[PDB]
Amino acid sequence: DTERPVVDFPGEINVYRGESFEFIATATDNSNAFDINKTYVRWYNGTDSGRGTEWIEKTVTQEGNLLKVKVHGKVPVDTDIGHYTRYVMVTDAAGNQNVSNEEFSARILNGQFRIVIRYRPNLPENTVLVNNPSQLSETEKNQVREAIKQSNPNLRPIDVAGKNLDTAISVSNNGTTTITFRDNRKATIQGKDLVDTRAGS
Ligand SMILES: [Ca+2]
């Protein structure tokens, strides 16, 4: 057996701080036999799960001819916002890896994926009442920003663009709010969830 096994797994997965996740990689091989103990979710220069992503776990089973690699874990509430490149590596019974040790040392490889760590914002319990829901005043925008800050205590200055919560949380004129994180990724909160018209009944 000199044919490498082949992993099928998305090229990008999104996970959220404070939440658990689970994604299934499947692998096939001409021999239908695997060395199950030599399965790794790894980075390019080690078989460990990599610096900053030590919380990535794996569970490996085989169902008939199909190797099933469960990529799972719980993202820490205080891990860094950003993304990483990691790899699902499998080994057939004959010792052939899906990716060679030379390829890792040096183009997307089999089993390669980007894992993006995101923050999911909590909505405030109550909306802010505003005079004109399409022309918020600066005071009303500040009140919306403070409502978001209050409901999102684990969103810290280090997590956002410019290390400044007051400028990274940008409230538009109709209350729709964009948060820009330290990796320049975004979260958009609809204004209908944040503001209501004063005396609108
Ligand atoms: Ca093989």
Coordinates of C-alpha atoms and ligand atoms in Angstrom, one line a residue:
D1 CA 0.0 0.0 0.0
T2 CA 1.6 3.2 -1.3
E3 CA -1.6 5.2 -1.8
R4 CA -2.2 8.0 0.7
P5 CA -5.5 8.3 2.6
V6 CA -7.7 11.3 1.8
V7 CA -9.5 13.6 4.3
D8 CA -12.8 15.4 3.6
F9 CA -13.3 18.5 5.8
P10 CA -14.4 22.1 5.2
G11 CA -11.6 24.6 4.4
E12 CA -12.9 27.1 6.9
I13 CA -14.8 26.6 10.2
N14 CA -16.1 29.2 12.6
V15 CA -16.1 28.8 16.4
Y16 CA -17.3 31.1 19.1
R17 CA -15.8 32.0 22.5
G18 CA -17.6 30.4 25.4
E19 CA -19.3 27.8 23.2
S20 CA -18.7 24.2 22.3
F21 CA -18.2 23.1 18.7
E22 CA -18.2 19.8 16.7
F23 CA -17.2 19.2 13.1
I24 CA -16.8 15.8 11.5
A25 CA -13.9 15.0 9.2
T26 CA -14.2 11.8 7.2
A27 CA -11.3 9.9 5.6
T28 CA -11.1 7.1 3.0
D29 CA -8.2 4.9 2.0
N30 CA -7.7 2.2 -0.7
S31 CA -6.9 -0.3 2.0
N32 CA -9.9 0.7 4.2
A33 CA -7.7 0.3 7.2
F34 CA -6.2 3.0 9.4
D35 CA -3.8 3.5 12.2
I36 CA -6.3 5.1 14.4
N37 CA -3.8 6.2 17.1
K38 CA -1.9 8.2 14.5
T39 CA -4.7 10.7 14.0
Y40 CA -3.9 14.4 14.7
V41 CA -5.5 17.8 14.5
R42 CA -2.2 19.7 14.2
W43 CA -0.3 22.8 13.1
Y44 CA 2.4 22.7 10.5
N45 CA 5.4 22.2 12.8
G46 CA 4.0 19.8 15.4
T47 CA 1.5 17.0 16.0
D48 CA 0.1 19.0 18.9
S49 CA -2.9 21.2 18.4
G50 CA -0.8 24.4 18.3
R51 CA -0.1 27.5 20.4
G52 CA -3.3 29.3 21.3
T53 CA -5.6 26.4 20.2
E54 CA -4.7 23.9 22.9
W55 CA -8.5 23.5 23.5
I56 CA -9.0 21.7 20.1
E57 CA -9.9 18.0 20.9
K58 CA -10.5 15.0 18.6
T59 CA -12.4 11.7 18.9
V60 CA -11.7 9.0 16.3
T61 CA -13.9 6.1 15.3
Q62 CA -14.3 4.0 12.2
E63 CA -17.6 3.0 10.7
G64 CA -17.1 0.3 8.1
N65 CA -14.6 1.7 5.6
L66 CA -14.9 5.4 6.8
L67 CA -12.7 6.9 9.4
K68 CA -14.6 9.5 11.4
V69 CA -12.6 12.3 13.1
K70 CA -14.7 14.4 15.4
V71 CA -13.1 17.8 15.8
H72 CA -14.6 19.3 19.0
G73 CA -14.0 21.3 22.1
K74 CA -15.1 24.3 24.1
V75 CA -13.6 27.7 23.2
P76 CA -12.3 29.6 26.2
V77 CA -14.1 32.8 27.0
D78 CA -10.8 34.7 26.9
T79 CA -8.9 33.1 24.0
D80 CA -7.5 35.5 21.3
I81 CA -9.9 36.6 18.5
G82 CA -8.4 35.7 15.2
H83 CA -7.8 32.8 12.9
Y84 CA -5.3 29.9 12.6
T85 CA -4.3 27.3 10.0
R86 CA -4.6 23.7 11.3
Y87 CA -4.7 20.3 9.6
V88 CA -6.5 17.0 10.1
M89 CA -3.8 14.3 9.6
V90 CA -4.7 10.6 9.3
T91 CA -2.5 7.5 8.7
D92 CA -3.5 4.3 6.9
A93 CA -2.6 0.9 8.3
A94 CA 0.5 0.9 6.1
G95 CA 1.8 4.1 7.7
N96 CA 1.0 6.5 4.8
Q97 CA -0.2 9.9 6.0
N98 CA -2.7 12.0 4.1
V99 CA 0.0 14.7 3.9
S100 CA 3.8 14.1 3.9
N101 CA 6.1 15.5 6.5
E102 CA 7.9 17.3 3.7
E103 CA 4.8 19.2 2.5
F104 CA 4.1 20.4 6.1
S105 CA 7.6 21.7 6.4
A106 CA 7.3 23.8 3.2
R107 CA -1.4 25.9 -2.0
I108 CA -4.0 24.1 0.2
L109 CA -3.0 20.7 1.6
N110 CA -5.4 17.8 2.1
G111 CA -7.1 18.2 5.5
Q112 CA -6.0 21.9 5.8
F113 CA -8.5 24.3 7.3
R114 CA -8.7 27.8 8.7
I115 CA -10.3 28.0 12.1
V116 CA -11.8 31.5 12.9
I117 CA -12.4 32.4 16.5
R118 CA -15.3 34.8 16.8
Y119 CA -17.2 36.5 19.6
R120 CA -21.0 36.3 19.5
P121 CA -22.5 39.5 20.9
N122 CA -25.2 39.4 23.6
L123 CA -28.2 41.7 22.9
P124 CA -29.2 44.0 25.7
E125 CA -32.3 43.0 27.7
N126 CA -34.1 46.3 26.9
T127 CA -34.1 48.6 23.9
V128 CA -33.2 52.2 24.0
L129 CA -36.1 54.6 23.3
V130 CA -35.2 57.2 20.6
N131 CA -36.9 60.2 19.2
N132 CA -36.4 59.4 15.5
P133 CA -35.4 55.8 14.7
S134 CA -33.6 56.8 11.4
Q135 CA -31.8 59.8 12.9
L136 CA -30.3 58.9 16.3
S137 CA -28.7 61.7 18.2
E138 CA -25.2 61.4 19.6
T139 CA -26.7 60.9 23.1
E140 CA -28.9 58.1 21.8
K141 CA -25.9 56.4 20.1
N142 CA -23.9 56.6 23.3
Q143 CA -26.8 55.0 25.2
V144 CA -27.0 52.1 22.7
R145 CA -23.2 51.7 22.9
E146 CA -23.4 51.6 26.7
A147 CA -26.2 49.0 26.6
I148 CA -24.1 46.7 24.4
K149 CA -21.0 47.2 26.6
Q150 CA -23.1 46.4 29.7
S151 CA -24.5 43.1 28.2
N152 CA -21.0 42.1 26.8
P153 CA -18.6 42.2 29.8
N154 CA -16.3 39.6 28.2
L155 CA -15.8 41.8 25.2
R156 CA -12.6 43.6 26.3
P157 CA -10.5 46.4 24.8
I158 CA -7.9 43.8 23.6
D159 CA -10.6 42.0 21.6
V160 CA -11.6 45.0 19.5
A161 CA -10.0 47.2 16.8
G162 CA -7.8 49.9 18.2
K163 CA -8.2 48.5 21.8
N164 CA -11.0 51.1 22.1
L165 CA -14.6 49.8 22.8
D166 CA -16.0 53.3 22.3
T167 CA -14.8 53.5 18.7
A168 CA -14.9 49.8 17.8
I169 CA -18.6 49.7 18.5
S170 CA -20.0 51.9 15.8
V171 CA -23.7 52.8 16.0
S172 CA -25.3 54.0 12.8
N173 CA -28.0 56.6 12.4
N174 CA -30.8 54.0 12.6
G175 CA -29.3 52.0 15.5
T176 CA -27.8 49.2 13.4
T177 CA -24.4 48.6 15.1
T178 CA -21.2 47.2 13.8
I179 CA -18.5 45.8 16.1
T180 CA -15.0 45.6 14.6
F181 CA -12.7 43.1 16.3
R182 CA -8.9 43.0 16.6
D183 CA -8.6 40.8 13.5
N184 CA -10.8 43.4 11.5
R185 CA -13.7 40.9 11.4
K186 CA -17.1 42.2 12.1
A187 CA -20.4 41.5 13.9
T188 CA -23.6 43.4 12.9
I189 CA -26.5 43.9 15.2
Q190 CA -29.8 45.0 13.7
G191 CA -31.2 48.3 14.9
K192 CA -34.6 46.8 15.5
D193 CA -33.0 44.7 18.4
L194 CA -31.5 47.8 19.9
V195 CA -33.9 50.8 19.7
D196 CA -37.6 51.5 19.7
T197 CA -39.5 54.7 18.9
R198 CA -40.3 56.9 21.8
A199 CA -44.1 57.4 22.2
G200 CA -44.7 55.1 19.2
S201 CA -47.9 53.2 20.4
Ligands
CA1 CA -3.4 3.5 1.6

